[PDB]
């Protein structure tokens, strides 16, 4: 599955800007680690806590090098209108990282979260700068209240990257 490279894709996008563009995760190797996530739908009646404590950490995430994808199965557009949309009228407001448009449900099916052919399953990505999958995270600890061990995950994924791992010491080959 995915332990080489994650598996890539060509998507529209809404950025922060509210711009449209286009996104490939290749875009990102060498340059960025990456955290993908993936909701159900846009403008539901169950709020967004996922993309909205994500967004509310941005900045925690951009001082590690990481750079934030929202992944639904919806499309620019609605995206947009989405972003439009004051939180208290049900919406996500102004988030300021991007979000890609998954319309051929293709991406949440290269992941394995495509629930019954139509909307993605909640789950957490975390993609290194070569593009390789570090974690996934799914179901109970796919969660807006997950935000700080996603953190200490990238803490530990660049820690790991520094220093290797340690041996048990005592123990010898031989």
Same mark, same amino acid.
């Given at each position: 599955a995915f332990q080489g490279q994650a598996p890539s894709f060509k998507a529209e996008a809404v950025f922060g800007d509210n711009t449209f563009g286009e996104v490939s995760?290749?875009?990102?190797?060498?340059k960025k680690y990456v955290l993908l996530y993936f909701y159900p739908?846009? $403008?539901?009646?169950?709020?967004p806590s996922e993309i909205i404590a994500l967004d509310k950490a941005l900045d925690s995430f951009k001082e590690r090098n990481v750079e934030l994808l929202g992944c639904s199965v919806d499309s620019k557009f609605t995206h947009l209108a989405w972003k439009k949309t004051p939180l208290s009228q049900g919406g996500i407001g102004n988030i300021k990282h991007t979000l890609i448009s998954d319309i051929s449900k293709s991406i949440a099916r290269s992941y394995d979260?495509? $629930?019954?052919?139509s909307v993605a399953l909640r789950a957490f990505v975390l993609i290194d700068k070569q593009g390789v999958v570090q974690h996934l995270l799914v179901n109970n600890?796919?969660?807006?209240?997950?935000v700080d061990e996603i953190l200490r995950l990238i803490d530990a994924l660049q820690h790991h990257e520094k220093y290797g791992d340690v041996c048990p010491a005592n123990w010898q080959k031989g």
């Open positions: 995760l290749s875009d990102f190797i060498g739908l846009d $403008f539901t009646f169950v709020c979260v495509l $629930f019954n052919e600890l796919a969660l807006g209240r997950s």
